[PDB]
Write a protein that binds this ligand. Structure first.
Ligand SMILES: [Cl-]
Ligand SMILES: [Cl-]
Ligand code: NA
Length: 164
């Protein structure tokens, strides 16, 4: 298990434009295109991201290319953020993947807003951090995924992602 396999489980793979859990147009492995309700606007974002005029449909290779860029962008966002970087640096490799997962789903600014959770994680108070992380819109709207990510922070293992 690793961050790519983890996010592939959590996000799925769909080669045609679809709406995510928030109703936003998305494609591939959880690649958010836009929050606009205009499908035309979403298609324009897709063409710009891929570099060609699509029909709202991409190939698996193209989906995996966006995924590689998006995982890279999540790590980049953590490292340039003054709140997230010290937490990331303090964590082991498995919990680092859990933090990347959160940033992938919600964005750098969203995760940096989890001020009290981040402090508990840096303090390595894993059970307390896990309780605090669940007191969130994030957990309420996507509870099964949030439970997997939180279990990863709590235990430092991949137990939540094995034999699914
Ligand atoms: Cl992009
Ligand atoms: Cl969920
Ligand atoms: Na998804």
């Amino acid at each position: 298990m690793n961050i790519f396999e983890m996010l592939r489980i959590d996000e799925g793979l769909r080669l045609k434009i679809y709406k995510d859990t928030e109703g936003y147009y998305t494609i591939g492995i959880g690649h958010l295109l836009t929050k606009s309700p205009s499908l035309n606007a979403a298609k324009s974002e897709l063409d710009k991201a891929i570099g060609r005029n699509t029909n709202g449909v991409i190939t698996k290779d193209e989906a995996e290319k966006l995924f590689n860029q998006d995982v890279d962008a999540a790590v980049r966002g953590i490292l340039r953020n003054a709140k997230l970087k010290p937490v990331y640096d303090s964590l082991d490799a498995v919990r680092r993947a859990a933090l990347i997962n959160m940033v992938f789903q919600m964005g750098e600014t969203g995760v940096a807003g989890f001020t009290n959770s981040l402090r508990m994680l840096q303090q390595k108070r894993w059970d307390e951090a896990a309780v605090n992380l669940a007191k969130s819109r994030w957990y309420n709207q996507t509870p099964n995924r949030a439970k997997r990510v939180i279990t990863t922070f709590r235990t430092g293992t991949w137990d939540a992602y094995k034999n699914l």
